[PDB]
Amino acid sequence: VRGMNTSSAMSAFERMEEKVLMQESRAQALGELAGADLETQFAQLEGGSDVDDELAALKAQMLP
Amino acid sequence: KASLDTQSTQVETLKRNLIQLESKISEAKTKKEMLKARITTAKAQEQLQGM
Amino acid sequence: MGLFDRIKRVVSSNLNDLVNKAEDPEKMLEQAILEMQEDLVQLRQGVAQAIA
Amino acid sequence: EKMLEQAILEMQEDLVQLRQGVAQAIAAQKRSEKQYNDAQNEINKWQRNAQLALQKGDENLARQALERKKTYTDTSAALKASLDTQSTQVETLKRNLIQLESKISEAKTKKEMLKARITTAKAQEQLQGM
Amino acid sequence: AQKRSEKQYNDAQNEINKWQRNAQLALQKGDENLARQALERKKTYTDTSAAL
Numbered sequence A: 001v002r003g004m005n006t007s008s009a010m011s012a013f014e015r016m017e018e019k020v021l022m023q024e025s026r027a028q029a030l031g032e033l034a035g036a037d038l039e040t041q042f043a044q045l046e047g048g049s050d051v052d053d054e055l056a057a058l059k060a061q062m063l064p
Numbered sequence B: 001k002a003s004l005d006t007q008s009t010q011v012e013t014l015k016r017n018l019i020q021l022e023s024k025i026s027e028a029k030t031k032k033e034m035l036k037a038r039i040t041t042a043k044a045q046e047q048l049q050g051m
Numbered sequence C: 001m002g003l004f005d006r007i008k009r010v011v012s013s014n015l016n017d018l019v020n021k022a023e024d025p026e027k028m029l030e031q032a033i034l035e036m037q038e039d040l041v042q043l044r045q046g047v048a049q050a051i052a
Numbered sequence D: 001e002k003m004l005e006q007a008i009l010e011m012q013e014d015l016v017q018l019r020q021g022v023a024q025a026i027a028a029q030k031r032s033e034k035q036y037n038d039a040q041n042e043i044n045k046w047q048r049n050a051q052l053a054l055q056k057g058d059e060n061l062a063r064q065a066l067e068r069k070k071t072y073t074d075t076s077a078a079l080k081a082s083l084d085t086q087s088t089q090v091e092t093l094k095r096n097l098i099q100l101e102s103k104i105s106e107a108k109t110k111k112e113m114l115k116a117r118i119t120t121a122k123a124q125e126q127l128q129g130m
Numbered sequence E: 001a002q003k004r005s006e007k008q009y010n011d012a013q014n015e016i017n018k019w020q021r022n023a024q025l026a027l028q029k030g031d032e033n034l035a036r037q038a039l040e041r042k043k044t045y046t047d048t049s050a051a052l
Helices: A008-036 A038-062 B002-050 C002-022 C025-051 D002-056 D059-129 E002-029 E032-051
Strands: none
Touching: A008 A038, A008 B002, A008 C025, A008 E002, B002 C025, C002 D002, D002 D059, D059 E032, E002 E032
């Protein structure tokens, strides 16, 4: 109940937390860096431009 | 009788503690499943992120 | 203190090598759940004796 | 980070030792109280005996009982004095533990701050290489 | 590190809200000492949050 250093419950939570926190933080940070780059941002804008022209073409195709 | 009353109270406290302990262990089992999923996702993400 | 300085350097080197091997998440999780269940059984036996 | 990690492990073990001392102090207070309680109970029994002795007509026994009560009272007074001194020490120990609990949390916060500055310094070093 | 501090700060804020609810509950309960203790805990949390 007090929570001794050698107690299994206290030790397990601490060990699990350190490993879990580092892994989660690192994965999120790595993903963010890719997003930060200008080229990636440009691609998203290009994609938006790309979908609308196709839709217009699709409308023309399905018009008759 | 005096000894019995003191002992009985101690026994009751121990029983209460056991019930509390039971709740805690069950929670830990649930946590492991959640923890495993998070770890797997991070590992996959790291390899992808580097590329 | 000279002894204190020596102790810190030796302890740090030893601790770093040791922690990495046992820091894997999967091994730690399996060990923790098994230990608590065993403890409960032992506690119950003690409680049972008191009740008896 | 290595210096910080070693320190954190060390502080936790020290706290446990302090807790054990506090428990002993708590036990000591209880033990003195029990002795004091026992003395009071003993005094009551002695008082009953003295009254009984008077009815019996044995003057010497009654006088002896009174002397015993005085000795018990003196012992009780000594125990009470000891308890008061012990209580002040116990309060200080309890206060120290509370202060220590606040301190360990602060230490954890300090480590995060320390880690951030070190990383920044490393980044500066990279610029020099370029 | 920034994310970790934010999470801790967020956790502290969440903890404070829980503490506030408990203090209100404590007043309804009539236990004055518990409510006072909760307020002290909130102050400590606030100080920690400020440091963060």
